[PDB]
């Protein structure tokens, strides 16, 4: 999504709210590499970090389902209609089809007499 | 409170304690089986074994199928005038209704 | 002169010649496979008398290993 | 011939010494694999039977081989596991692939339906102590109960159709026996006969309903990545939709109609999400779903032409996707995670295992006639001849089977690493030597495909 | 007799560096060497057969390895030798003879300078079965098999950022061209149950399903056309010699070659011919607007490929198949060289890929230059300079149709469009004051270099003498119209210069003409990674995670689940948790069940 | 050979009249590769040929014939129908490969004329399109899988068909 | 071409010698362009861009603050493109 | 700070100008017609005024902003040698070669050991120096460089040996 003028540089202030903002995010920044930096160099490791990060990241996605989905109100009941629909859609098309097809078999004759495999 | 339940160690192979080696611990097994019988099967079923899958035992009267049919095309067309099918395998049947 | 980027090269190029060896091993007979071809007759196709339908190998055709395989 | 000798592995490895074990298993198991491409690809017009009924002949499966080949395979993968734990434990779990060797040879040869139905559902008892035990991650349960509750929920209604149908049809047997079944008059009361007989071949044979059964089968490792294969060897083992819909049901494919549809959109949105999924055996899971469900379109259709693929898939799936999964499992064993993105990183790491990784992925796709080519275009115009609206969706499920395996590709074929310092020997060379009994049976089909695409070939 | 025995050594000879491949005899450094003396040999082989075929002879040969017997089908390796099969051979062999010895200057002292030729070994085998397909089912493993390969080329160089999306796309749009191919594979099978390609030519019926919905619908995902191409400057991101092969011959005819080999099919229906010309011209001035504005060494002759590939589906529209090989056939010698010569700037010159930063002088650089003056203007319509027999034979056929005149109208256009993207590489960078792009930059002649181009310049300049005279030619369309139609196709190069000239001299001098801000460009990219690359991959996994994923596959085909366990665990705790003990609660409960069985049911 | 139909003779034969130059390059070179490696692949192959001296013949073909109709005997039974299947699912094997000599017939026609294309020939195209359509109704194609007991309906709901027709002209 | 240690202080030199609003004989290599040698605020960030330009194009935004000096803007040229072995 | 701003906003300006003008003497010469208008208010401070203009400063600018930029040739992102030519080996998978093909250059190995050597027992007193810097949380933006001189080794020992080379 873009909006008609694309975000880069546009709509910033010095001001005092912003210049404590800066510092609130990099203090989480060097706190979170420092501990990185501790057990990245030294000789004595040999194996894959596991960072708290990507581990979250992984269960976001294959768990946290049950817990969810509590509140169904409408916004579920829209994705049933987006979900289990398209098979009823595709259900009309191949079915006249059907009718166009076999009523040619009995009834003047549509298949070609070079037509032998399946 | 895990009291003992906190017992995990890293173990690889990797070249410390193995020089080159597959299976974990004992040099003189390794040799014996990651190599040898390992790469006997390797030998037989892979190199022996494609001279059958389908080459040679005919395999469901596929090559059969071909001298029958041209045998019976030559035949069929000095003598008869319908060429192999027309209403084969049916004659003077019962009726319909 | 330099030093290089480096591989493990040893463990890779171990396993080809290790996997060769055995292709090789079983070679031998792919050697011969050829020979029976050019020694042994290989195909012939004539009518045959009514005797025998089945001797050894019971429809033998294209290669004499056909009939060989098809005793055991 | 087959039976007994198999049956013999049992007490080769109890009775061997603590040592050696792991190459008695795997040598003997060779040797009996070599003698069933020697004796079962004989065969006439009509597959002639072998014996009395206990096991019989092959019609339309060389399926059989393939399990003959993941038969020492297996084997192979569960070396890095198992390792650390005791002999019992290590002696225990290998004669329970011997055992599941054992049923899964009785599935294919038995030309039976009463007899096959009580080796179907056998199949899956060793499997389930495989898949709840040696779990690395949590969740065994949310897999180990979901293996049965899915499978056994779908097979128990085989009782209630299988018996209904000799108790008023004559015996169901030797199938060759069957020139006896009558076609369906289409009644209401045949409509759940017909359902029941299906419903167990559509849970193992994965739709997109019902579907939910294999990828948290496959998530959850049950020991390291060879016993992931077994897995894929229960997809083809459910073959008997091939031998149901053929002879018992001829007549009715009424009732086939929505259930082609169902595995139809168990094609575009299985691929879809098998995009930003963050697990590696997670990619591998829902790509085993579309492969599969090419096989269930071809079925029901019923043209001759269809069964050339479908049979060719069974095998083509069986020995490109149990590839992937060992694959998979040679970065488990050095990573210890199944996440795609902090893996990362073939050639300048991993030299020789980037070359296995192309052809693995590369079979996913169109290739040079090896074998997937080959099952799958038989499908895609019997699709034609069946309905032409057809190939405007299945030309869609062509895109993103390029998406299947280049982003696997992709996220791998990256010069990074940063974070990770194992992983210092590549192969070992048994972790190679897997990859290549895996594409090399594929590289020997390329010239003789008619031993593998034979339903009266 | 020798004729058929030669075609196959042609093949095996490309064959044998792969049976080396595999270890067999060990070669270090001279691996890179033996590839360029086994296809010195190979094109002595193909030079033969084609001699043949200017006197007499025609064979197609079958191999008899008929690996499916499936269903009254045989298919063997069949080799067809015929005509628009047979010339391309030895003409591609040349193309990749220069390129593969290019190939010991460019990506000189790497560790991987084995696995280079490899991949590009089996690139030119894909393409020969191909181009020699006789079946149908033989054609699916050239098409797909170099559009397989590109992968391992295109993203040759390691990229650990948008390398690999470049090699990606390429298969992408590819596969979205195969939704046709596959389309007319199976439609094939169904109304024809020979398969192969000898059929078509007998009993031929008339649909329009069959050309229109697959080979047209093929020939956007190859060829890139308007349809689908942006991937041709993405694949620019890999190495000089490898974008050279899949821009000049060898991957560009794929989609076109389709077309000209089912020729009967295309004169006979009429509504595939108005459809691609249709196609043609919207890609005769979209792709060629793209090689103005976009100043890049190699993405400048990347989109030129698809502007003269404009005119390749005009000769499949005008139902001529006979020329319509001759433009490709010349068109391989056109940008085999424009592509190689203009990569020889690019590794000079540090490492450089923009005009702007280039100013490689004619009298710094004389070996490369003049190549670079050859090559540029034999791409326009120029009367002898190889460009008059593949360019205007198009143009004055074009003239005299019952076709449509929008059509006619936007190729004229680009026929004086080719001499301003032309102009730009030589005004641009080439003439004038030195850009200098760097501080001491390092550019001389290699001895490899020399025995390279010298040998692409007698293939560049006698290709219209050759290729023209020998081949038969059927009905000649020049006759009418002196000024109207034949004086047209070169009256376009010669104002579409001059128009050139005043407008990049303008812009050169300048001195205070001051450039502007607001201009009207949808020129930049063709605005198509708005599309493709922002909005049809947004669209694809929208749909992925917003739906499918946080809906049916996670919860919906799931929530058949609880109904089955969470509303039976609900049932199960009213008959465990139910009557706190006592004896008296259960023996009330036996007071009713008799009362059900005496009143509530009628048994007795 | 006795088989195939073909062409009857090939004319071929070159004049060399207009321009001397070199006489022709490529007649030169097709006596050259003659003697090079041609006669020399000859030599080899009639050596083998020598050396095998001692050859068997055998059975090469079975014969296996009529062993009763299928459409005679019927209701049920596995001593009877299975014998009668057999010859069925022979027939239709040898038919798929009928169909395939027919084939490459006009395959023939399609190499050797190549320019002439349709106007000639014309007896290869006859005899193609009157198998085939014949192999259409008799076997398979609408029948579904091949099934010698489902085989005796599609012919009876042909005879049927045929039958309506008749009586109402 | 490879770079030496002593040809890249020299290069650097070369273009510094060149820039004509600052003078030649008042600044050789070792003296601070930020106090010492006449530069202004905008002309700091003008100097550096010119010689990307003649060495290898590679420049940072963040690191542009950091290097002021012409003997520490020639040290970190060559760190970042490997140079002197 | 205001300052950065102003100084990436002309470091920018001036890279993409080449992308309009095609000659060198051109291109000097609309440099100083830049220059001009930035000089005119660089003499007065103020801290409404100078950050309205630094808002507008992005007009203009970004109506003739994408002419496709020469994005350099070893540089990151853009196009044209980003990470290509530059795969190389890390220094992780330097220890991975086995017995028989390590003995193969013998120098290599030797160096490589006496420096390996050197990193580990300094580990040691590089991880009490590290927290021995006063911050009391964990660390400020930049790594703290080593106050002691007879040790050395500044924290970090492996970030700026072992890299890739062309």
């Excluded at chain 1, 930096?37 to 894959?48: T, W």
Aim: charge should be neutral; charged fraction near 15%; glycine fraction near 4%.
């Amino acid at each position: 999504x873009x909006x008609x003028x694309x975000x880069x540089x546009x709509x910033x202030x010095x001001x005092x709210x912003x210049x404590x903002x800066q510092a609130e995010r990099l203090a989480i920044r060097s706190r979170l590499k420092r501990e990185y930096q501790l057990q990245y160099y030294d000789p004595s490791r040999r194996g894959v970090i596991e960072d708290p990060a990507l581990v979250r990241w992984t269960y976001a996605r294959s768990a946290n389902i049950y817990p969810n989905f509590r509140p169904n109100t409408k916004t579920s009941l829209l994705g049933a209609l987006f979900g289990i629909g398209p098979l009823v859609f595709w259900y009309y098309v191949f079915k006249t089809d059907r009718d166009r097809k076999e009523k040619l078999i009995q009834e003047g004759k549509l298949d070609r007499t070079f037509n032998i495999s399946y | 409170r895990w009291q003992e339940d906190p017992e995990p160690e890293d173990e690889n192979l990797y070249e410390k304690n193995p020089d080159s080696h597959g299976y974990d611990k004992d040099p003189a097994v390794d040799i014996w089986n990651m190599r040898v019988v390992f790469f006997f099967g390797f030998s037989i079923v892979l190199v022996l074994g494609s001279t059958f899958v389908a080459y040679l035992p005919d395999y469901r009267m596929q090559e059969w199928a071909r001298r029958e049919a041209e045998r019976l095309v030559k035949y069929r067309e000095a003598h008869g005038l319908p060429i192999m099918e027309s209403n084969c395998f049916d004659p003077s049947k019962i009726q319909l209704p | 002169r330099l030093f290089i980027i480096k591989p493990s090269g040893f463990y890779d190029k171990r396993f080809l010649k290790l996997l060769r060896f055995y292709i090789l091993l079983t070679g031998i007979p792919v050697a011969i496979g050829i020979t029976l071809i050019n020694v042994x007759x290989x195909x012939x196709x004539x009518x045959x008398x009514x005797x025998x339908x089945x001797x050894x190998x019971x429809x033998x055709x294209x290669x004499x290993x056909x009939x060989x395989x098809x005793x055991x | 011939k087959y039976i007994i000798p198999t049956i013999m592995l049992m007490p080769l490895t109890w009775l061997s010494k603590n040592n050696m074990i792991w190459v008695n298993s795997t040598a003997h198991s060779l040797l009996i694999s070599f003698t069933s491409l020697l004796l079962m690809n004989q065969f006439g017009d009509n597959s002639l039977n072998f014996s009395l009924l206990f096991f019989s002949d092959s019609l339309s499966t060389p399926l059989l081989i393939l399990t003959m080949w993941l038969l020492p395979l297996m084997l192979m993968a569960s070396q890095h596991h198992l390792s650390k734990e005791n002999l019992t434990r290590k002696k225990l779990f290998i004669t329970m692939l011997i055992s599941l060797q054992l049923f899964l040879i009785m599935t294919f040869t038995a030309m039976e339906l009463i007899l096959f139905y009580i080796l179907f559902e056998a199949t899956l008892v060793p499997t389930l102590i495989i898949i709840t035990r040696w779990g690395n991650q949590t969740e065994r349960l949310n897999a180990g109960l979901y293996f049965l509750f899915y499978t056994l929920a779908g097979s128990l209604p085989l009782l209630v159709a299988l018996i209904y149908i000799q108790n008023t049809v004559g015996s169901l047997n030797f199938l060759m026996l069957q020139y006896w079944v009558q076609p369906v008059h289409n009644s209401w009361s045949n409509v759940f006969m017909w359902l029941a007989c299906m419903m167990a071949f559509m849970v193992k044979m994965p739709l997109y309903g019902l579907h939910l059964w294999l990828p948290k089968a496959h998530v959850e490792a049950p020991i390291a990545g060879s016993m992931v294969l077994a897995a894929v060897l229960l997809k083809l083992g459910g073959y008997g939709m091939l031998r149901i819909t053929l002879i018992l049901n001829p007549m009715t494919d009424f009732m086939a109609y929505p259930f082609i549809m169902l595995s139809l959109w168990g094609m575009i949105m299985t691929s879809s999400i098998c995009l930003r999924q963050t697990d590696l055996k997670s990619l591998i899971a829902y790509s085993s779903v579309s492969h599969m469900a090419l096989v269930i379109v071809a079925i029901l259709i019923q043209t001759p032409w269809s069964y050339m693929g479908a049979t060719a898939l069974m095998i083509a799936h069986g020995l490109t996707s149990s590839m992937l999964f060992c694959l998979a499992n040679s970065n488990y064993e050095r990573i210890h995670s199944r996440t795609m993105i902090l893996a990362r990183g073939l050639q300048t790491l991993l030299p020789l295992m980037a070359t296995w990784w192309l052809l693995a992925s590369l079979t996913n796709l169109a290739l040079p006639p090896t074998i997937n080519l080959i099952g799958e275009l038989f499908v895609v115009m019997s699709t034609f001849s069946w309905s032409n609206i057809t190939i405007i969706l299945m030309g869609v499920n062509m895109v993103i089977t390029a998406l299947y395996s280049l982003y696997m590709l992709i996220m791998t074929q990256r010069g990074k690493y940063t974070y990770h310092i194992n992983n210092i020997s590549p192969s070992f060379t048994r972790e190679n030597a897997l990859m290549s009994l895996h594409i090399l049976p594929l590289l020997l089909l390329t010239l003789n495909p008619k031993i593998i695409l034979g339903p009266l070939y | 007799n020798m004729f058929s025995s030669l075609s196959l050594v042609t093949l095996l000879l490309l064959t044998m560096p792969i049976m080396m491949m595999s270890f067999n005899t060990y070669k270090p450094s001279n691996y890179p060497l033996y590839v360029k003396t086994a296809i010195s040999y190979a094109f002595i082989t193909s030079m033969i057969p084609t001699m043949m075929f200017i006197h007499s002879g025609q064979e197609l040969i079958i191999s008899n390895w008929h690996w499916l017997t499936i269903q009254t089908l045989k298919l063997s390796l069949s080799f067809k030798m015929d005509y628009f099969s047979m010339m391309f051979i030895p003409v591609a062999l040349f193309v990749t003879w220069s390129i593969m010895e290019f190939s010991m200057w460019y990506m000189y002292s790497d560790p991987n300078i084995n696995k280079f030729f490899k991949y590009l070994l089996l690139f030119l085998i894909t393409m020969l079965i191909l181009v020699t397909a006789n079946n149908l089912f033989q054609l699916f493993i050239g098409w797909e098999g170099v559009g397989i390969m590109s992968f391992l080329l295109i993203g040759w160089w390691y990229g650990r950022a948008d390398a690999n999306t470049a090699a990606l796309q390429a298969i992408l749009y590819n596969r979205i061209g195969d939704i046709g191919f596959i389309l007319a594979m199976a439609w094939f099978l169904t109304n024809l149950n020979t398969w192969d390609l000898q059929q078509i030519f007998m009993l031929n019926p008339s649909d329009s399903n069959m050309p229109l919905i697959g080979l047209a619908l093929a020939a956007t995902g190859k060829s890139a056309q308007f349809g689908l191409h942006p991937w041709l400057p993405s694949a620019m991101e890999g190495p000089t010699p490898v974008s050279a092969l899949l821009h000049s011959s060898t991957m560009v005819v794929a989609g076109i070659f389709l077309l000209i080999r089912f020729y009967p099919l295309t004169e006979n229906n009429k509504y595939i011919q108005s459809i691609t010309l249709c196609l043609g011209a919207i890609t005769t001035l979209f792709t060629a607007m793209c090689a103005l504005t976009q100043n890049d060494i190699k993405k400048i002759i990347a989109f030129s490929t698809s502007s003269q590939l404009g005119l390749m589906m005009v000769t499949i529209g005008i139902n001529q198949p006979y020329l319509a090989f001759l433009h490709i056939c010349t068109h391989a010698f056109f940008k085999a060289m424009l592509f190689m010569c203009s990569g020889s700037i690019i590794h000079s010159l540090n490492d450089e890929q923009d005009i702007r930063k280039m100013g490689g002088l004619f009298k710094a650089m004389p070996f490369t230059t003049t190549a670079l003056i050859v090559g540029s203007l034999a791409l326009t319509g120029m009367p002898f300079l190889t460009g008059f027999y593949s360019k205007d034979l198009i143009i004055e056929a074009a003239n005299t149709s019952y076709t449509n005149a929008w059509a006619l109208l936007m190729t004229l256009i680009a026929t004086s469009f080719t001499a301003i993207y032309s102009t730009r590489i030589i005004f641009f960078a080439l003439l004038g004051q030195p850009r200098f792009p760097t501080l001491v930059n390092i550019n001389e002649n290699n001895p490899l270099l020399i025995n390279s181009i010298k040998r692409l310049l007698i293939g560049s300049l006698f290709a219209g003498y050759i290729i023209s005279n020998n081949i038969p030619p059927t009905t000649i369309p020049q006759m009418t119209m002196p000024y109207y139609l034949k004086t047209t196709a070169l009256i376009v190069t010669i104002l579409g210069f001059i128009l050139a000239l005043e407008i990049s001299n303008m812009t050169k001098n300048l001195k205070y003409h001051y450039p502007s801000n607001a201009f009207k460009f949808s020129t930049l990219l063709g605005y198509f990674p708005t599309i493709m690359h922002r909005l049809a991959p947004y669209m694809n996994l929208s749909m992925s995670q917003k739906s499918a994923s946080s809906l049916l596959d996670l919860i919906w085909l799931e929530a058949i689940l609880p109904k089955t366990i969470s509303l039976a665990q609900m049932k199960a705790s009213t008959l465990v948790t139910n009557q706190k003990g006592l004896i008296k609660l259960y023996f009330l409960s036996f007071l009713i069940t008799i009362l059900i069985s005496m009143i509530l049911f009628n048994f007795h | 050979x006795x088989x195939x139909x073909x062409x009857x003779x090939x004319x071929x034969x070159x004049x060399x009249x207009x321009x001397x130059x070199x006489x022709x390059x490529x007649x030169x070179x097709x006596x050259x590769x003659x003697x090079x490696x041609x006669x020399x692949x000859x030599x080899x192959x009639x050596x083998x040929x020598x050396x095998x001296x001692x050859x068997x013949x055998x059975x090469x073909x079975x014969x296996x014939x009529x062993x009763x109709x299928x459409x005679x005997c019927q209701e049920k039974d596995v001593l009877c129908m299975f014998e009668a299947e057999m010859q069925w699912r022979r027939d239709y094997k040898v038919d798929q490969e009928i169909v395939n000599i027919i084939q490459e017939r006009l395959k023939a026609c399609q190499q050797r004329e190549g320019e002439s294309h349709r106007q000639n020939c014309a007896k290869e195209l006859e005899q193609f399109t009157q198998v085939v359509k014949a192999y259409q109704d008799r076997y398979x194609x609408x029948x579904x899988x091949x099934x010698x007991x489902x085989x005796x309906x599609x012919x009876x709901x042909x005879x049927x068909x045929x039958x309506x027709x008749x009586x109402x002209x | 071409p490879p770079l030496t240690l002593e040809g890249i202080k020299d290069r650097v030199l070369y273009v510094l010698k060149l820039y004509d609003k600052i003078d030649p004989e008042k600044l050789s290599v070792n003296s601070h362009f930020m106090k010492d040698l006449g530069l202004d605020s905008l002309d700091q960030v003008e100097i550096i861009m010119a010689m990307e330009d003649e060495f290898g194009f590679e420049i940072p935004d963040i690191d542009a603050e950091k290097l002021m000096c012409p003997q520490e803007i020639v040290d970190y040229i060559a760190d970042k493109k490997d140079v002197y072995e | 700070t205001h300052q950065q701003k102003v100084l990436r906003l002309y470091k920018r300006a001036l890279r993409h100008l080449e992308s309009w003008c095609i000659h060198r003497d051109k291109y000097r010469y609309f440099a100083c017609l830049l220059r001009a208008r930035f000089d005119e208010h660089k003499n007065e401070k103020d801290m409404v005024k100078a950050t309205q203009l630094l808002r507008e400063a992005e007009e203009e600018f970004w109506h003739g902003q994408h002419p496709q930029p020469y994005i350099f040739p070893e540089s990151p992102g853009g196009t044209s040698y980003e990470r290509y030519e530059c795969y190389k080996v890390p220094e992780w998978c330097l220890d991975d070669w086995h017995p028989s093909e390590k003995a193969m250059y013998p120098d290599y190995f030797a160096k490589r050991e006496q420096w390996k050597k050197l990193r580990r027992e300094s580990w040691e007193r590089e991880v009490x120096x590290x927290x021995x810097x006063x911050x009391x949380x964990x660390x400020x933006x930049x790594x703290x460089x080593x106050x002691x001189x007879x040790x050395x080794x500044x924290x970090x020992x492996x970030x700026x040996x072992x890299x890739x080379x062309x």
